[PDB]
Amino acid sequence: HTWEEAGLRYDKAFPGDRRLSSVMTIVKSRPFREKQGKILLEGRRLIADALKAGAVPKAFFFSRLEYVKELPVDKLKDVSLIKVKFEDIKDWSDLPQGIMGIFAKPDPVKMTYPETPLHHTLPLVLICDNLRDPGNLGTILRSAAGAGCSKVLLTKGCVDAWEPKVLRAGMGAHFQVPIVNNVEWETVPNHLPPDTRVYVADNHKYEEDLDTKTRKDWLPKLEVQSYDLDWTGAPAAVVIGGETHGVSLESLQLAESTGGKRLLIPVVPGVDSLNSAMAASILLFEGKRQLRI
Amino acid sequence: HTWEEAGLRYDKAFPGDRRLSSVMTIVKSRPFREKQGKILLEGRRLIADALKAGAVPKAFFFSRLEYVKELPVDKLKDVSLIKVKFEDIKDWSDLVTPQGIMGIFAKPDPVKMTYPETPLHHTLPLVLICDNLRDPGNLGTILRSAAGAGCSKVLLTKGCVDAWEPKVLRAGMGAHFQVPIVNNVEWETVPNHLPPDTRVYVADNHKYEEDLDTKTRKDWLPKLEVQSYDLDWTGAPAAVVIGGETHGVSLESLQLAESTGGKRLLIPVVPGVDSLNSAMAASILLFEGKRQLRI
Amino acid sequence: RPVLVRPGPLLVSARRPELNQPARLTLGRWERAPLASRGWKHRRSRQDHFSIERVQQEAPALRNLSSRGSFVDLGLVLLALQEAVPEVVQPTSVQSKTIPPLLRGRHLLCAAETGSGKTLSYLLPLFQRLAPRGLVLVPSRELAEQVQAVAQSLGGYLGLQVIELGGGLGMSRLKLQLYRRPAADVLVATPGALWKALKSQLISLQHLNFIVLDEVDTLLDESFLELVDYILEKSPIAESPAELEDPFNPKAQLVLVGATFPEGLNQLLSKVTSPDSLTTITSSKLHCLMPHVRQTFMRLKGADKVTELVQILKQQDKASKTEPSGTVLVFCNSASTVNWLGYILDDHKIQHLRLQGQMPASMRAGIFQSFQKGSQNILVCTDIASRGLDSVHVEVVINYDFPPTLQDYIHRAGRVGRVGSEVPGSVISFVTHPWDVSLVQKIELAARRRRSLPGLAS
RNA sequence: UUUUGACGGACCAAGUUACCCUAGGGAUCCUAUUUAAGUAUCGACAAUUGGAUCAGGACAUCCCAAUGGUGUAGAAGCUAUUAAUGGUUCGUUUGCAACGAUUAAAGUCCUACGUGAUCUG
RNA sequence: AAUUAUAUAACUUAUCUAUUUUAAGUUUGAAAUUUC
């Protein structure tokens, strides 16, 4: 049953609807999703979070009309609201509390982050090094979201931040900090703010990126700094060791060229490289304290 | 029938034995776990971490003998070693494909648990309290987070996740056995569990706060000042309370902090997202004290 | 349209019902059939499709067994056959014609479809008739494993040793495998591996009494034509059955088995034996359409093929959710599409296998065994899997990329409707864009005329 | 274009047309077979959106129940056989997971969402 | 739509003018080609 009320339109799922068929190609295929510039959202709260953040939505599929009325319909101008089968939603999602929402792939540089962290926002950049765990990436973004980092960088090979599972792990953290994906190491220096020192928390797999002939003479002798010392006198960039790769070679080389050090976190054994969420969390937070003080 | 190979004795199980049936219900059905008070541990080196750390073994079942060699052979002498079919193991665990091995454990006693000295090198005079935790990956991640952070001791209040639930332990992947944990802490005894008058800081920006207007939060319960998380809060022995996944901190926690002279710590989040994942909620505050305490 | 009291089951069923053929209508060579694929040009008409429905639920091979002579009439071992292979209660048409002459030592050429009993057609006389005594040449390593496994199972009942040699394998490794295994009465080897052993003189065919060639058309490929010639010069061949039975001058009996034969094979056989000494047997269903097998044709663009494939996969998932369903076989023309498509499947969190010719030989062997073990019900494979692949439980064969030739389709088609098939097989083929419509037109035209497909002459 | 160096493969890009053109097609729980327990007339079994309401069945046994053995004195337990007998709650789920509160136990599943037959155009 | 889009138009640089220390880029598109 399709209903129009007060200029607000929500449809019902139709038998053989090609809209659902086209969505399936878009959702799981990130290159096609990037080609279509879309993302998928899960949950009324997380759905409402994107609407509050000003992200442009695409389409909503829901088992009950109550969810649409429960959500702010004012922000649902651009979405074709479709009533769908509950079994279909769980089939569409690889994980859906009765509703799923398709959103335009946001550009975090273009996303609107309001004042509250901006008052607490730092000139601090978080860099994820070969972060291949979707759970950590979303779990990481809480720290960046709560910390107030000016920007977040993910190196090439890291998980797609806009993947809906990463959103679930971060529970909307993508709408709370700028994230840059698939950054090339050669272009990383351009991604650093002016006068920015790059700090690498060091815990090795990164030694496999070395030519065998030059393997042993290519190790940087970059200074080791205790993470408890002051490092935020100027804008700083933070590197996080990947779960499988740890801190990469290029991060160490870049830090020396940028005048930085190793803001070294003594890594407790049992975790070969401190959990990327754990490693990410510590580096940001007292930086707020250091510059606040 | 026990088979001896390279000094290792293992029985060949037959499907349908009453022992197999009991394990299936415990792992699959959480209420049966509460009824019987039994737990499941998976993984040969994960089992090794448990037994070396004082976990109480009941029996170990493996698909291939190679796992036994990687198992804590020192702790297998008195534990029943039975080689079982992988299909029998699959029927048991919430995971279709376990790591070729699973073990039956009773509720470990924290008093007898042995934790590696590695957290102690980075351990802080900081104690953690868990409030109505409901997610297993977060708890396993929280203890894996603690196993990465170095929390001195952890207090679990009533209503939290069963720390020994099989999926909870899998996420910890040995972190459950690396940090001290106290279970079934009564809210009245929480201040006594901490050093008396220990400044308790409650993580507040929560799901209950989303449904409830921010203004109506200080009428009947003790009023806690809202402090920025980065402002030094570890000048005295500090305690941190973390709300349950997508639920938030409880009323009792807010009463606790004021009685001990603590205050609310504020996690500035971008408007447009009311809260975030609870697992790192401990981590974000736990590390903040870590550097402050180290300095 | 008026409702006739007795309608006809659709021989051709299309998304557009106007062109469906319900009843007894045969058009013939001269008449241009109004095929559903007749004008499949302008891709604007999305989702056009037609399917050929199954006509029979009982296996045609089991049908008419009463009209075929018993094994005793074939000169046949039966007790071992009953124990080893009880499933073959009565001989098939190919088996009945082929077995008797083989026991008499007459050279035989057999043209029959896959799954018609060709393997058993020569194996039974081979066992009775019997420095190896018998040689089996197979073009693909995949077929070698099945033939060796099938032969080993028969050998186990008879206490015989069978070994496999896959082509493309290193000389050092090939020698290592040979030395680590005991002497085998019958050897199954590929031209690449067999040629390497012959060059290194690890085996001699002067004492060979029987040579078996499987998939002669594929064995005759230029990739193996030179290797076969090198094998032939080392192999003495019997000229008449009398010499085969002569103890003073024993020679090797030649038997040829294939689904198609390239023109000029007679000249190759003529130089080895007289043309009149070759017994050629052709199956009644050779190059004939299978009515009991469902063939599905769907109009999908490259973007829509992924869309429909997900829908088809979901349809199979729903079928499994209600009642047990057979495995699904996915055929792709290129490895790159398999890898490109495979990543999409991985994004869908779908358990699936990827098989293509360029994968490591060791890696390919393990995956093939895993699929036979039932590790995963979804297998994506290239044309390397169109030969020597077991598909007794495969319910749906999905040709994601349209087969380049009809002959390849037949090999893919033979995967369904095999002896002992638990589930009714189906075939699905995709056409992307106006690239190719004649091939669909030819297939559809033959079905309406109930005639053999063009270009299939052996 | 011949040579020297440490098995499987020949093409990409939307709408719209009543401004149109051509080709046409229309209108202007049954049903059909087969079987026949009970072939005048019939005829089972068969073969050819969330929910609510009520559950049925499988045993791969959770509780209940029948037993052997015991590092079982008794009673509790632990291990082992036999058994589908009836049962196996109510909710929260920031959505694949888990928690709360109870229960003798809140087994694991299957049964076209297991199963509801407005009114109008 | 995809793909280009030195019609033009703009800016940058030449250009042409002042002083004084159209072409080449890019962008729009007059359009072109292919498919729908």
GROMACS .gro file of N, CA, C and O in nm, chain A residues 16 18 21-22 24-25 28-32 90-92 94 163, chain C residues 46-47 303-304 306-307 310-311 314 317-318 321 344 347-349:
model
  128
   16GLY      N    1   0.875  -0.837  -0.758
   16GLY     CA    2   0.967  -0.822  -0.868
   16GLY      C    3   1.022  -0.683  -0.886
   16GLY      O    4   1.067  -0.648  -0.995
   18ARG      N    5   1.249  -0.401  -0.941
   18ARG     CA    6   1.388  -0.391  -0.983
   18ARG      C    7   1.468  -0.294  -0.897
   18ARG      O    8   1.591  -0.296  -0.903
   21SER      N    9   1.657  -0.512  -0.671
   21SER     CA   10   1.760  -0.584  -0.745
   21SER      C   11   1.881  -0.495  -0.771
   21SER      O   12   1.996  -0.539  -0.756
   22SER      N   13   1.858  -0.370  -0.811
   22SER     CA   14   1.969  -0.279  -0.836
   22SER      C   15   2.045  -0.248  -0.708
   22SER      O   16   2.167  -0.233  -0.709
   24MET      N   17   2.108  -0.440  -0.454
   24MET     CA   18   2.197  -0.548  -0.413
   24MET      C   19   2.334  -0.535  -0.479
   24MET      O   20   2.437  -0.559  -0.415
   25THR      N   21   2.337  -0.496  -0.607
   25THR     CA   22   2.465  -0.473  -0.673
   25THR      C   23   2.539  -0.357  -0.607
   25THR      O   24   2.662  -0.362  -0.591
   28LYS      N   25   2.686  -0.441  -0.171
   28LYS     CA   26   2.802  -0.523  -0.139
   28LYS      C   27   2.922  -0.492  -0.227
   28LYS      O   28   3.035  -0.524  -0.188
   29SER      N   29   2.902  -0.431  -0.343
   29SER     CA   30   3.011  -0.400  -0.436
   29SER      C   31   3.055  -0.256  -0.410
   29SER      O   32   2.995  -0.162  -0.461
   30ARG      N   33   3.161  -0.240  -0.330
   30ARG     CA   34   3.211  -0.106  -0.301
   30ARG      C   35   3.255  -0.033  -0.427
   30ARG      O   36   3.220   0.086  -0.441
   31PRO      N   37   3.329  -0.094  -0.520
   31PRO     CA   38   3.360  -0.021  -0.645
   31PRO      C   39   3.237   0.026  -0.719
   31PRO      O   40   3.235   0.137  -0.772
   32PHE      N   41   3.132  -0.057  -0.723
   32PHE     CA   42   3.005  -0.012  -0.779
   32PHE      C   43   2.937   0.087  -0.686
   32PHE      O   44   2.876   0.185  -0.732
   90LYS      N   45   1.682  -0.887   0.639
   90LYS     CA   46   1.791  -0.972   0.687
   90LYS      C   47   1.860  -1.043   0.572
   90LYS      O   48   1.979  -1.073   0.580
   91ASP      N   49   1.787  -1.071   0.463
   91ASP     CA   50   1.850  -1.126   0.344
   91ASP      C   51   1.938  -1.023   0.276
   91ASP      O   52   2.049  -1.054   0.231
   92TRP      N   53   1.891  -0.898   0.268
   92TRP     CA   54   1.970  -0.793   0.205
   92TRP      C   55   2.095  -0.761   0.287
   92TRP      O   56   2.203  -0.741   0.230
   94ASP      N   57   2.400  -0.851   0.549
   94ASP     CA   58   2.481  -0.965   0.592
   94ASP      C   59   2.484  -0.980   0.743
   94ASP      O   60   2.547  -1.075   0.793
  163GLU      N   61   3.216   0.107   0.480
  163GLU     CA   62   3.146  -0.020   0.484
  163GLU      C   63   3.046  -0.019   0.600
  163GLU      O   64   3.081   0.026   0.710
  634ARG      N   65   1.471  -0.520  -2.139
  634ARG     CA   66   1.537  -0.593  -2.031
  634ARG      C   67   1.453  -0.712  -1.984
  634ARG      O   68   1.330  -0.711  -1.993
  635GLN      N   69   1.522  -0.814  -1.936
  635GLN     CA   70   1.465  -0.928  -1.863
  635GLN      C   71   1.398  -1.031  -1.954
  635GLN      O   72   1.326  -1.118  -1.903
  891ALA      N   73   2.601  -0.583  -1.609
  891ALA     CA   74   2.555  -0.539  -1.478
  891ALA      C   75   2.440  -0.625  -1.427
  891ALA      O   76   2.435  -0.659  -1.309
  892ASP      N   77   2.348  -0.662  -1.516
  892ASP     CA   78   2.232  -0.741  -1.476
  892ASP      C   79   2.266  -0.887  -1.450
  892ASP      O   80   2.195  -0.953  -1.374
  894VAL      N   81   2.517  -1.002  -1.278
  894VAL     CA   82   2.540  -1.007  -1.134
  894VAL      C   83   2.408  -0.996  -1.060
  894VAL      O   84   2.385  -1.066  -0.960
  895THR      N   85   2.319  -0.909  -1.107
  895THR     CA   86   2.189  -0.893  -1.042
  895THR      C   87   2.109  -1.022  -1.047
  895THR      O   88   2.061  -1.071  -0.944
  898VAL      N   89   2.266  -1.309  -0.837
  898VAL     CA   90   2.228  -1.299  -0.696
  898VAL      C   91   2.085  -1.348  -0.677
  898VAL      O   92   2.055  -1.421  -0.583
  899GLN      N   93   1.995  -1.308  -0.767
  899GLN     CA   94   1.857  -1.354  -0.758
  899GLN      C   95   1.848  -1.505  -0.775
  899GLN      O   96   1.775  -1.572  -0.701
  902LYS      N   97   1.980  -1.660  -0.464
  902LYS     CA   98   1.878  -1.650  -0.359
  902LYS      C   99   1.766  -1.751  -0.382
  902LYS      O  100   1.715  -1.811  -0.287
  905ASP      N  101   1.890  -2.069  -0.266
  905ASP     CA  102   1.892  -2.066  -0.120
  905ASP      C  103   1.753  -2.091  -0.063
  905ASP      O  104   1.737  -2.166   0.034
  906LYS      N  105   1.651  -2.028  -0.121
  906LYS     CA  106   1.515  -2.051  -0.076
  906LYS      C  107   1.474  -2.197  -0.096
  906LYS      O  108   1.409  -2.256  -0.010
  909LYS      N  109   1.625  -2.392   0.169
  909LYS     CA  110   1.561  -2.361   0.296
  909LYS      C  111   1.432  -2.440   0.316
  909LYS      O  112   1.391  -2.462   0.430
  932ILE      N  113   3.316  -1.015  -0.568
  932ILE     CA  114   3.178  -0.974  -0.543
  932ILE      C  115   3.108  -1.076  -0.453
  932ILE      O  116   3.037  -1.040  -0.359
  935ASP      N  117   3.223  -1.032  -0.106
  935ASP     CA  118   3.153  -0.920  -0.045
  935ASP      C  119   3.014  -0.961   0.003
  935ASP      O  120   2.962  -0.904   0.100
  936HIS      N  121   2.953  -1.059  -0.063
  936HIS     CA  122   2.821  -1.108  -0.024
  936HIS      C  123   2.828  -1.208   0.092
  936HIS      O  124   2.723  -1.256   0.135
  937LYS      N  125   2.947  -1.239   0.142
  937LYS     CA  126   2.964  -1.335   0.251
  937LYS      C  127   2.911  -1.472   0.211
  937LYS      O  128   2.849  -1.543   0.291
   0.00000   0.00000   0.00000
